[PDB]
Symmetry: D3
Subunit: 159 residues, 6 copies
């Protein structure tokens, strides 16, 4: 009945993302983990890779649905019959950008309510960007990623 | 099914608060607007005034319950069987303090989720303290308050 | 007599920019809207496009002069006999970068005073970057741009 | 023609304030240095002390007028026929509070423009409160104050 | 050879403080844990209580010296022949205020270097004030304090 | 005996960097100025150029060692037997990113203590990026760079 969308680039999905979507499923009946194509960010993993990684990483959560999209997130939320948009908040830079996004999304879809969750202390200082940078220099990021994602990141960089 | 609390001092309740609680009622089945006694900040309105003002200002919202409390926010939420704690986010200063409170509340009550809502642009720059400061110095705050609150504030300041 | 420069990339000029330059004209006798070439930012519109867009968008303001430039803004301000440099302030990230810029410009031209204006609430959460991103995904940005700019942005993306 | 007000508590006026008001006088025809009674913060110097100190410290500026006021900043600016309100910006904490005040002042007096000036690097880390705190604890604040203010502060602290 | 001071009110000392001072002892030969009398903030524990609590809580650290002081931090560091001043950084609000203090301390004592340490994620969201606030309102703060401090806090709050 | 690493891209090294490393040498017995290859940032100067520039710029400091590296900084610090990692803190954006880095480095090398220094007021608003931008537009940056670096930057841009 209550449907929420959790959009992001998820390049790749981290334990921080896993924490947020898990909390979302404890709050709403159905959660769409929505992976934006984000070509402007030149992602390391293709959209199809990121969807598969997230599907495996969230298979244990019964009310999570992983979908990729290139639409405007506001339209995609409407077309998923979502009335809640989930984002995790990490730092001041996040907050300020999320504010901009939320006000734009409110303009585009006024009945879509943006709600923010604060991550666990364990994940409050990591990001996909940071994890990739450490991995690019062969540092150990097993603690920060789902097993399947760590394998795929290692495999990716080994090529 | 989902019970949420929206705690604060509400000294007095503003249109920013009304915006946040209205958004909350569109998200959750039952919202407790929880008014802290907050003696340490020496509020302008008494607790009984603040509760009465907030009840009148939210009477049109069918699933809002206005309740006073003097306990720790987490203790009151636990006793009310609430699993969601609503907070509005205004500025960076908000965010950092709310981050603190959220991590403390997660420690005190792990089954309580803190969710942050974003106010309309219309109310993004006001607070109870700013409204009181302007009104005390003979500025016009009509636009920022429910009618009943505006009347009570004028009466208060006329001493 | 009092001459001010309002420099920026204006890729493209938004209603937020229009608000700032309009306020500038209410404060100073002559305002130079100065469009930096900004090749490092790889702008969507060429400098000649951006100048024409801004000229049309500000034609109703009698004391606005639109000029493009690739010089150091401090030298360009001196060569325009400007003693005030206008910038609009939006978020914390803006403020911190504008501070850096102002201190550098003060080093380069000590008699050029940098003054900052805060935008209307309506435009406090938009930017050229955000508007382009929404438009790239076919979202409606008519509310955020001058008519001529919206047409040109639509036309640009339709190719 | 252009009348600007520079309001504050100036308890006491520092070289940071002198820097800001000096820059203002180079921008606008007439600058009112407006000293708030500010009883709620319990100032160290009385209003008559603060006005006298500021007058002496700005006597070399021909187009500065030092005036005390107890009204709302917007009410005083309106009554003084000022169309510019000067504020100095120091840090992020400044910025966010000044943003609030600016939006409130625009609501209260739309014909009043808030303009923000940036202090010299020399004064970017001081405030009246910090200076008083250092001086009270037997630290050297000579570098941060006009001579007349430094003398009065020593006299005050000798009690 | 290197003497460092770690000043604060420590009202009361928390596991965050213990973390910072422990890291300091691993960096410098001798660390003075300097407890400010700080009457202006009206501390919950007296100075003699705060010193006694901190001594017990740091007895396992061989190169820590706990000392009370009522002078300016810079004056005390000079008199203790310390050339390093330790401060912990928690949030953005910390950072900006510490930046101020550091620039003032460099002016007052140029031969004193301010170094900023970062607390563990475990303690990154707590402070003495937050701990007192939670404990006063019947919240569990056992995890955040040394055992001896927890006992003294309970005793204090039982009044 | 006490060994510290000061890592960064140093593209090119500025007087701000010189201030930080100089302060580091006043605090620790041996300082490794470590220049990260940073190919993702597409540096203006090659690693070998940046090392030579930094060597010349720090030749007057007896206990500075300039080394380039492409390793993970945490591993490089271990392999240099460094137990302190120095970073200068400039703005809020710096602080938030440095926090992320420090927590990651603590995960990778728990006995490596990250310590932050606040730069002199003179250099608190400059960066390699800003200096390059001014130089690209033929503005005078002699005040911000060591002589040898200014020459090399001029030479670079003259080609
Ligand atoms: C892909 C995408 N970028 C956006 C930016 C703002 C609002 C939206 O709905 C957006 N969707
Ligand atoms: C009254 C009150 N102060 C708090 C501080 C932290 C957490 C809480 O739940 C609190 N409740
Ligand atoms: C194009 C341009 N970038 C600048 C950076 C700093 C100062 C200036 O005057 C600048 N002009
Ligand atoms: C004394 C005073 N407090 C204010 C708050 C907001 C706006 C104003 O103009 C104010 N004046
Ligand atoms: C007690 C005290 N307040 C201070 C403020 C600035 C610098 C210092 O060294 C201080 N010490
Ligand atoms: C080159 C490099 N990037 C890093 C990011 C995090 C930690 C490290 O140790 C790093 N080293
Ligand atoms: Cl209380
Ligand atoms: Cl007052
Ligand atoms: Cl004190």
């Amino acid at each position: 009945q209550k449907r929420a969308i959790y959009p992001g680039t998820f390049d790749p999905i981290t334990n921080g993302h896993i924490d947020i979507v898990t909390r979302a499923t404890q709050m709403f009946d159905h959660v769409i983990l929505a992976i934006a194509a984000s070509p402007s960010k030149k992602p390391m993993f293709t959209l199809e890779e990121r969807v598969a990684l997230a599907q495996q990483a969230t298979a244990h959560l019964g009310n999570v649905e992983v979908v990729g999209f290139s639409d405007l997130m506001a339209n995609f939320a409407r077309n998923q019959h979502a009335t809640v948009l989930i984002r995790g908040l990490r730092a001041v830079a996040d907050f300020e950008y999320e504010m901009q996004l939320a006000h734009m999304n409110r303009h585009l879809m006024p009945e879509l309510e943006s709600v923010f969750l604060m991550p666990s202390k364990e994940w409050s200082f990591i990001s996909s960007s940071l994890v990739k940078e450490v991995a690019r220099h062969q540092g150990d990021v097993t603690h920060f990623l789902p097993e399947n994602v760590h394998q795929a990141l290692m495999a990716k960089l080994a090529v």
